[PDB]
């Protein structure tokens, strides 16, 4: 059963998301060009951040939070929301990512703005895994809102309230996926599991030079010892 | 209605969870500068046992021994910390607000902070422990969530991710059913468990930001603990 409350809420989510996108002054897509490209992407991100602020203000429940927690929520989730939105715009065929519905970008374009391959591959890796899933726009809208309302982000002063406001969007995703693919039942938990790997991706962008990890291939000798 | 096949998967989890623990009940350097250092040395010892227990447990998890060694190790290295947080949660008592390590060893927030460990890490643990406690999990539910956690394909250095994700499927599915049979009317309780694997991702990476803390005591981390942890 989609409740009338749900069915209206998802319409508001999807319309809020559309009304974001259709809202050019950006340095045109082309040393100078590799900088032009880099600044191109910088401005792509800048607009992205503002979209995500405007989407959020329209998520029932959001503007009811304390202003501090609103900000704390958006700080923490911007890069996860950017990632999810990019997966949303990933075209699996052309193997390309479409920004401002129109401009198309492949690995190579990103490498050529001088970008960290070590982070472009994860991006792409994420987009393809999301593709398998077959999300629609309601599903991403809903996944985003759930992602906005994470009680565990730093500087949340009212986590229990954040956590109560999350629940509406967890129920609606739960019902939407039960109606959409009723013979599956693991598509719901699989979507939510991407929020897990999505948190690890995110923490890699912001990694501190004093807390860099990555061991690579080679096995831990001492753990292997313990193993047999 | 939990299938017979899942019940048995679950019995196997709960039984290994129990063989795990029963193993060790001590030789851990006794609880009391010297004061601080002997406390952290104690916890350091507790962490080493926990590693043995986690390795012993994951061995007994259906399907684990079927992965390649490389992958087996990779998976363990990356989850050790999350499993340790998940098992600290389970050992958390919200009336006394204490964590029970081993059997009957009892620790409060201030025990840990008195070992030189920092608020930035210890508090989130106790916040996370408290949150888990409101979930009301029983042992199967933990054993299952730990297995789901072990089977995470997106781990650093994993060569058969498809094989590990597929292994993760029967554990999610068994959790789903186990939760709907246990609170047939609280259908958000399951998502709320899954969201916790998310939280733990973050806790794990808050842990990796502790090196200044450890790199400055000038007595070294046991080497197992050194690699498991960096
Ligand atoms: C240049 C710099 C600072 O390194 C840099 C810049 N961006 C960057 C950030 C966000 C967007 C982006 C994400 C979106 F969801 C949307 C949709 O609202 C849009 S857009 C054009 O308004 O349609 C733009 C594009 C980017 F290129 C990045 C990173 C974060 C790597 C990045 C990159 Cl490339 C692609 C995809 C995701 C991410 Cl998150 N890095
Ligand atoms: C001081 C040092 C060496 O840096 C350090 C050490 N530990 C530490 C790590 C694991 C365990 C622990 C976890 C378990 F799941 C279990 C049960 O298997 C047990 S036990 C005694 O076998 O019952 C012991 C206890 C600890 F004290 C920690 C941190 C990681 C903060 C820590 C602390 Cl305190 C409590 C809870 C989680 C975490 Cl992860 N840090």
From Swiss-Prot, chain B:
Ubiquitous. Residues 5-230 form the NR LBD domain. Keywords: Activator, DNA-binding, Isopeptide bond, Metal-binding, Nucleus, Receptor, Transcription, Transcription regulation, Ubl conjugation, Zinc, Zinc-finger. One of its GO terms (biological process) is negative regulation of gene expression. There is a cross-link at residues 182, 220 (Glycyl lysine isopeptide (Lys-Gly) (interchain with G-Cter in SUMO2)). Signal peptide: none annotated. It is found in: Nucleus. Sumoylated by SUMO2 at Lys-182 and Lys-220 during the hepatic acute phase response, leading to promote interaction with GPS2 and prevent N-Cor corepressor complex dissociation. Forms a heterodimer with RXR. Interacts with CCAR2 (via N-terminus) in a ligand-independent manner. Interacts (when sumoylated) with GPS2; interaction with GPS2 onto hepatic acute phase protein promoters prevents N-Cor corepressor complex dissociation. Interacts with ABCA12 and ABCA1; this interaction is required for ABCA1 localization to the cell surface and is necessary for its normal activity and stability. Belongs to the nuclear hormone receptor family. NR1 subfamily. Nuclear receptor that exhibits a ligand-dependent transcriptional activation activity. Binds preferentially to double-stranded oligonucleotide direct repeats having the consensus half-site sequence 5'-AGGTCA-3' and 4-nt spacing (DR-4). Regulates cholesterol uptake through MYLIP-dependent ubiquitination of LDLR, VLDLR and LRP8; DLDLR and LRP8. Interplays functionally with RORA for the regulation of genes involved in liver metabolism. Induces LPCAT3-dependent phospholipid remodeling in endoplasmic reticulum (ER) membranes of hepatocytes, driving SREBF1 processing and lipogenesis. This is Oxysterols receptor LXR-beta. It comes from Homo sapiens. The lineage of its organism: Eukaryota, Metazoa, Chordata, Craniata, Vertebrata.
């Amino acid at each position: 059963q989609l409740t009338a409350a749900q069915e209206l809420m998802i319409q508001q989510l999807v319309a809020a998301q559309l009304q974001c996108n259709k809202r050019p002054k950006v340095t045109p897509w082309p040393r100078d060009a590799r900088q032009q490209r880099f600044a191109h992407f910088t401005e792509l991100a800048i607009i992205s951040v503002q979209e995500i602020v405007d989407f959020a203000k329209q998520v029932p429940g959001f503007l009811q939070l304390g202003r501090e927690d609103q900000i704390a929520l958006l700080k923490a989730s911007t890069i996860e929301i950017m990632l999810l939105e990019t997966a949303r715009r990933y075209n699996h065929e052309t193997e390309c990512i479409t920004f401002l519905k129109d401009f198309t970008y492949s690995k190579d374009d990103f490498h050529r703005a001088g970008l960290q391959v070590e982070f472009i591959n994860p991006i792409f890796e994420f987009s393809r895994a999301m593709r398998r899933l077959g999300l629609d726009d309601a599903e991403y809208a809903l996944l985003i809102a759930i992602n906005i309302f994470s009680a565990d982000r730093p500087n949340v002063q009212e986590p229990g309230r954040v956590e109560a406001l999350q629940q509406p969007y967890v129920e609606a995703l739960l019902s939407y996926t039960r109606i959409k693919r009723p013979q599956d039942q693991l598509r719901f938990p699989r979507m939510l599991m991407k929020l897990v790997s999505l948190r690890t991706l995110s923490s890699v962008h912001s990694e501190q030079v004093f807390a860099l990890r990555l061991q690579d291939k080679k096995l831990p000798p001492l753990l292997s010892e313990i193993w047999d």
